[PDB]
Amino acid sequence: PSWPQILGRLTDNRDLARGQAAWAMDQIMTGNARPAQIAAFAVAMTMKAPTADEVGELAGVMLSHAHPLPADTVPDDAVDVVGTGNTVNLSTMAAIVVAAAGVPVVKHGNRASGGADTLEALGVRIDLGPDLVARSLAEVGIGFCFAPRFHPSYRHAAAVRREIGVPTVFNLLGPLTNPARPRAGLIGCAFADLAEVMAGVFAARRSSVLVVHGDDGLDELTTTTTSTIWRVAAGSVDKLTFDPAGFGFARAQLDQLAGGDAQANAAAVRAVLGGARGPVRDAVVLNAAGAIVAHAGLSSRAEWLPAWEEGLRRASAAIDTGAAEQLLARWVRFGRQIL
Amino acid sequence: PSWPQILGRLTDNRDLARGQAAWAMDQIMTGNARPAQIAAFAVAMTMKAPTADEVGELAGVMLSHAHPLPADTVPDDAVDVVGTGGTVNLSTMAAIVVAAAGVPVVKHGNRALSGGADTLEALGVRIDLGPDLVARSLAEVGIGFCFAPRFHPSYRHAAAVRREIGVPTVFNLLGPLTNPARPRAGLIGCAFADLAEVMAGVFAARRSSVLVVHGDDGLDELTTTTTSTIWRVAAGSVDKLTFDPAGFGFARAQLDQLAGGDAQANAAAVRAVLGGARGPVRDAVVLNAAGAIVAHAGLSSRAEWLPAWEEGLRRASAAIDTGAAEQLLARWVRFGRQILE
Ligand SMILES: COc1ccc(C(=O)CC(=O)C(F)(F)F)cc1
Numbered sequence A: 001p002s003w004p005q006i007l008g009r010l011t012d013n014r015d016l017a018r019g020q021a022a023w024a025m026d027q028i029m030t031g032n033a034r035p036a037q038i039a040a041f042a043v044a045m046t047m048k049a050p051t052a053d054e055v056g057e058l059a060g061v062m063l064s065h066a067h068p069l070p071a072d073t074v075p076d077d078a079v080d081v082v083g084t085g086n087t088v089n090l091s092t093m094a095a096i097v098v099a100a101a102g103v104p105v106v107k108h109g110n111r112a113s114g115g116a117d118t119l120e121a122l123g124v125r126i127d128l129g130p131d132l133v134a135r136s137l138a139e140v141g142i143g144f145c146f147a148p149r150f151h152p153s154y155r156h157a158a159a160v161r162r163e164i165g166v167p168t169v170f171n172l173l174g175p176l177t178n179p180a181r182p183r184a185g186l187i188g189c190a191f192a193d194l195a196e197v198m199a200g201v202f203a204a205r206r207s208s209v210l211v212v213h214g215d216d217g218l219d220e221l222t223t224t225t226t227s228t229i230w231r232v233a234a235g236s237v238d239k240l241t242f243d244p245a246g247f248g249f250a251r252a253q254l255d256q257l258a259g260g261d262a263q264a265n266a267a268a269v270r271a272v273l274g275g276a277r278g279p280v281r282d283a284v285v286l287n288a289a290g291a292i293v294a295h296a297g298l299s300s301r302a303e304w305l306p307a308w309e310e311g312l313r314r315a316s317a318a319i320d321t322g323a324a325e326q327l328l329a330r331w332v333r334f335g336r337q338i339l
Numbered sequence B: 001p002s003w004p005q006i007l008g009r010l011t012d013n014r015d016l017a018r019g020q021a022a023w024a025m026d027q028i029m030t031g032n033a034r035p036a037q038i039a040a041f042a043v044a045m046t047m048k049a050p051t052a053d054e055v056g057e058l059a060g061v062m063l064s065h066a067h068p069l070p071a072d073t074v075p076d077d078a079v080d081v082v083g084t085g086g087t088v089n090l091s092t093m094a095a096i097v098v099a100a101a102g103v104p105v106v107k108h109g110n111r112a113l114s115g116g117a118d119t120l121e122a123l124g125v126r127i128d129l130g131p132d133l134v135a136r137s138l139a140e141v142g143i144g145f146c147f148a149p150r151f152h153p154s155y156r157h158a159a160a161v162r163r164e165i166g167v168p169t170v171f172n173l174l175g176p177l178t179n180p181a182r183p184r185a186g187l188i189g190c191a192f193a194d195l196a197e198v199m200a201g202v203f204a205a206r207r208s209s210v211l212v213v214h215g216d217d218g219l220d221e222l223t224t225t226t227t228s229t230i231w232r233v234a235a236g237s238v239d240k241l242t243f244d245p246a247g248f249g250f251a252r253a254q255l256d257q258l259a260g261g262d263a264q265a266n267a268a269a270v271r272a273v274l275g276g277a278r279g280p281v282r283d284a285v286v287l288n289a290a291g292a293i294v295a296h297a298g299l300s301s302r303a304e305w306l307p308a309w310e311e312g313l314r315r316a317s318a319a320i321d322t323g324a325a326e327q328l329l330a331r332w333v334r335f336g337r338q339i340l341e
């Protein structure tokens, strides 16, 4: 195995042999890959079109280098709510709403607005060690794994990612390398082909996940139009077309849903959790419900439609009853009380 | 203009906007491109499939950073004989034969398996010479060699990345398109049919008289193992042709018979061929030398394809069998040894 061999195979538009993606990622994680080699691999893998097996090797090697949460501190029904990339506004709000509905949530991200930035603008302490993320989950029902603290060996790839800027297969790794390893979640992707790849990876993990792609390009469930959902459970995938109009959701415009910077997002979080109505609320409710449906897929034998009706009810209620606003405040309170 | 913009465009399999490739290359040449950005660009451009316009921008910017040869020192009808990589043994021998046939030759390359420059050094040729001495070599010997690191010092950042990733990229095309002497004709081989057509487009834009050649066995030269595709470039237009050496009496050969080796072995092969040794290596050398001579003729006329080749094959054969090729290499070595005094 070597870079000329692996890079050559990719530029020739061939899928890699089993273990080659893993070899490449291990070189990258151990500081043995030159920045040029990392970049070449990232780009070549992207333009070749990665397979689920390849991405599975990349994520798997990365996790083998990550710091875990302490034993028996992550509830086995914890969920993730995130997109691959911007809808940080939607995913941040959805995550808070899901937690306020009684579902444990553990997120994973970094400062870019990134997921971490919006949370910091709300007064949340994002940079916590494993022991305290665990406490946060137990005491608040939500936690955040700061990527630099849990994936320190990813620093070389991270530097290259910043330098080239363009999205690559590495953008898919965030959701697939949550160090808390939640077994469920709502995972958005901006590209349909890659969404399907991600669903394949989650399937092999026996997770209960909704991998979602707005047919308008959104890396969340959209209200602008239909969405494609890759419904993942019991080692298999159920691909379907999803229309929120069937749940009474008005059609919105794309410019209404797009996130902004950390402060603009924070302002939007405060307004929505305060009860402000509009397209942004609807999108948050929609994706929160999606996460709740995924959560139900773990234990409940509840069917698709009734699961959604209950998920939408619980999401809306988490906002309307002030539970979400109250949970965020409790989350901020927790970080301040650590000192 | 930015890397995310340019790299984003390529990963979406779109051709670049005008000037974007030029911007990228200028960043690379001035040392302002990070290795990761250079690598990303090279790979992305390769997998998208580069256009003639894009490569023309790369080559043009690279040339603007290069040291030129002195004014009025390069003969108007100088030719190049080179491959973009798989046959260094063949292009080197063909170059000497072409020079011996009276066609000025100016090559361009680097030390590498013996590279083009390495083989010549093994024969006693001084390869690392400034522009004034390359000019003198062309005048006094009829052949010259531009040492790439000497003429393209600002390319060091790109070359370091090329070695690191190892895989062939669009940058492998730049050698023949950035010859500092800027010969207007030549025999240019490429191991990839699609990239060969791109190069032909660039030479056409320059209104060069060139044969871009591709062995249908993956050879970056005219092969004797099988047929070859040839893009006849002349008068700003391109004619794509199939080429069978058998139509000129050449017997089919095996690929392993044209096998290069270390610099000492290639040198031995050069001495053998120039000494008149018959065989498939000679045949391949004569065939590629003739190709360059046909391209040279295209500068001053549009002679018929078949008789051009027959005269070219004849001239190349004569250059060897008169001893002219062997004598020219000796004059080349002699010239190099004279520089010290
Ligand atoms: C300096 O060390 C680091 C710098 C940046 C990062 C990330 O940025 C990773 C990230 O988002 C992930 F995809 F979630 F993993 C990790 C380590």
Ligand SMILES: COc1ccc(C(=O)CC(=O)C(F)(F)F)cc1
Pocket (backbone or CB within 6 Å): B108, B109, B110, B148, B149, B150, B152, B153, B154, B155, B156, B157, B159, B174, B175, B176, B178
């Ligand atoms: C140390 O600085 C350098 C190192 C290597 C080279 C090349 O090797 C370029 C080359 O082949 C060309 F495309 F023909 F120009 C140039 C400068």
